[PDB]
């Protein structure tokens, strides 16, 4: 069942503007819902501030789409 | 299992132009397939051709968010 909801949660991480690819996603079931951690790629130009927005922004899409994500964290590496 | 597929399903149709909502939408598991029947509503004024288009894009889009879709028929009503 897994494959699937991860698939979604890239596709969906890598439509948010200033996403340059997702790193790194973990994924794990706990009970029937999803806890995940994720890092996402950033212009190295960007603030900190702006990567942090777009962090933030990620995670408003990903649970919005994702119903049964309960956690999920994300942080942002240059890229 | 079948309430959140729905959900996406009626989600995903209403966000293509043309739709005026989901007027019906049947949907069963095959296994672990989806099989659908739907019906959109569309503007009266709309010709027969436009409306064929909008079924054909509703067609598109769900079946391409929504994988475990196998089988999916739209149809179109003045609304
Ligand atoms: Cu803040
Ligand atoms: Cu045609």
Do not use: F
């Amino acid at each position: 069942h897994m494959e699937a909801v991860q698939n979604r949660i890239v596709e969906a991480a890598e439509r948010v503007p200033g996403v340059r690819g997702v790193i790194h996603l973990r994924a794990r079931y706990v009970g029937q819902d999803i806890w995940a951690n994720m890092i996402i790629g950033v212009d190295p130009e960007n603030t900190v501030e702006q990567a942090h927005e777009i962090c933030e922004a990620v995670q408003a899409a990903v649970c919005g789409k994702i119903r049964r994500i309960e956690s999920l964290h994300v942080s942002a590496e240059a890229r």
